């Protein structure tokens, strides 16, 4: 039901994001902010998904060696120069997107553009640096050196996307890590780090014209384009199970259950964001001002009552989106004996969206969704991530006002329609690590996606 518009005057009072396309095809996006610090970086449309099976892991390796010296600097000189500017260089690598962003002061904006351009365009992939990083990457590759939340994040993709490259991990298999060489990385740079796939984001005390001029000068020699990516069909969602039963790792079990989600540009994506908010998160060790027994979240409240002890030591919803697919589900960390109750309750919660979801819960979720999104845009790095991630995902940045406008239209009935179409009687994928005697078969859990009542 429609209860009015929550857009306010303050939402319109934000500096505009100016996006211009350079002649080579590189987009330059900037937003001015009244700050003494800035964030300037390069958000690229590269990642593990766009690697082949034999080369999986090259992108992650390159990201770890790109700041270890250039053809015009050395590692010590580069690190010294950044420190003198009072700046720090960051970088991450994902399945579909990558970034290389610097957090500096106002006077270091243009100087940092020069540093980042040199690293991206003229990386000196010294053999010694590669070999040392090979050891570090290999140690990280060991699952003993990986958290259980990182392990289940990767295994969810492995189980759900057996047929496509989205199932590949970022770090890569140990066989590939053992064999990556400079030539692999040089090829990856040539094919993927091209102007058409890069966005230069500058947030802070910045002027669009000046940033654009510097960008054109420093990125003049970048490869203009690479061949269009091979057209593929929708990533097939495999309803499978990948459970690592281990009764020798303590009492806590980690279970992740996934449904097929929606791509970034889907009209239903904001509905899935709201549904993710309704699921929410809960930790027995950080319950908040409201206790679990008296929580407005229905999943949390019913869970907190089970056996007078609570069946969720921790849980969170997740909504992962890619260009042509997505994953929607929940992650649980709970006592071994509580797993059956925990998965049963969260699946009952997701199934409830399709039958009996109250306006009260939706409206609370809208406010906490907006309180999480807006607070993320507080600092320059948060804004820069939002600009770079949103231009890659959508080709434009959605304004806070537009997000609120579209969220106003979504109500309990809209959530019910989307859930009924996509989540009710739907195929699921379960992945887990730990003592999981209580975890039932996939078919048993999949029947809990529909109700005999109502």
């Amino acid at each position: 039901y429609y209860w009015g518009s929550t857009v306010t005057t303050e939402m319109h009072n934000v500096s505009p994001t100016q996006v211009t396309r350079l002649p080579n095809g590189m987009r330059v996006a900037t937003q001015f902010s009244y700050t003494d610090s800035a964030t300037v970086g390069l958000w690229i449309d590269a990642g593990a998904r766009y690697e082949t099976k034999e080369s999986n892991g090259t992108a992650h390796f390159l990201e770890r060696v790109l700041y270890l010296g250039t053809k015009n600097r050395s590692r010590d000189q580069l690190e010294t120069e950044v420190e003198n500017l009072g700046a720090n260089l960051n970088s991450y690598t994902g399945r579909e997107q990558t970034a290389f962003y610097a957090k500096t002061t106002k006077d270091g904006i243009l100087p940092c553009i020069d540093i980042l351009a040199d690293c991206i365009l003229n990386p000196k992939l010294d053999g010694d640096e590669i070999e040392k990083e090979r050891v570090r990457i290999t140690q990280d590759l060991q699952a003993v050196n990986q958290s259980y939340e990182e392990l289940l994040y990767d295994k969810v993709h492995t189980a759900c996307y057996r047929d496509c490259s989205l199932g590949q991990t970022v770090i890569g298999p140990e066989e590939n890590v053992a064999t990556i060489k400079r030539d692999h990385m040089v090829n990856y740079l040539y094919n993927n780090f091209t102007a058409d796939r890069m966005v230069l984001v500058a947030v802070g005390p910045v002027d669009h014209a000046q940033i654009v001029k510097e960008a054109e000068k420093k990125f003049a020699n970048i490869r203009p384009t690479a061949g269009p990516r091979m057209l593929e069909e929708k990533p097939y969602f495999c309803a499978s199970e990948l459970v690592y039963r281990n009764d020798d790792m303590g009492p806590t079990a980690h279970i992740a259950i996934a449904y097929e989600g929606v791509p970034w540009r889907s009209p239903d994506y904001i509905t899935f964001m709201l549904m993710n908010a309704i699921i929410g998160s809960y930790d027995k060790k950080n319950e908040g001002l409201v206790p679990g027994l008296q929580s407005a979240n229905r999943i949390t409240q019913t869970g907190a009552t089970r056996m007078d002890v609570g069946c969720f030591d921790y849980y969170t919803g997740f909504n992962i989106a890619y260009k042509d697919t997505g994953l929607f589900g929940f992650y649980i960390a709970t006592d071994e004996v509580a797993v059956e109750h925990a998965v049963g309750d969260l699946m009952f919660g997701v199934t409830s969206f399709s039958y009996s979801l109250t306006e009260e819960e939706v409206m609370k979720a809208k406010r906490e969704l907006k309180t999480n999104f807006f607070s993320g845009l507080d600092n320059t790095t948060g804004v820069a991530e939002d600009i770079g991630r949103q231009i890659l995902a959508y080709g434009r940045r959605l304004s806070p006002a537009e997000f609120v406008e579209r969220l106003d239209q979504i109500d309990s009935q809209e959530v019910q329609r989307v859930a009924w179409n996509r989540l009710h009687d739907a195929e699921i994928t379960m992945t887990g690590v730990g003592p999981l005697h209580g975890l039932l078969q996939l078919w048993d859990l999949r029947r809990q996606t529909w109700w005999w009542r109502y």
Partner: protein, 79 residues
Amino acid sequence: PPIQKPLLPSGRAVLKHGRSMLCSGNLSYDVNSTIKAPECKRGMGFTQFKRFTPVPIESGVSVGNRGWFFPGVIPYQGH
């Protein structure tokens, strides 16, 4: 648009006891910082599943006692 924070807000003070905005180091990457951007040792994306609550999990710790039992007393058939 992307969500950059966990669904469970921390609700705690960011700066540590006795540490100020001048002497807390750089909160973006300092080890003791409560808002340090996590490490991409195995790639980006796992923060959507990560539990950001610092206190380690105590499996089975009770949170559903409405005041009906004392600590250390085992309920029998819920009574």
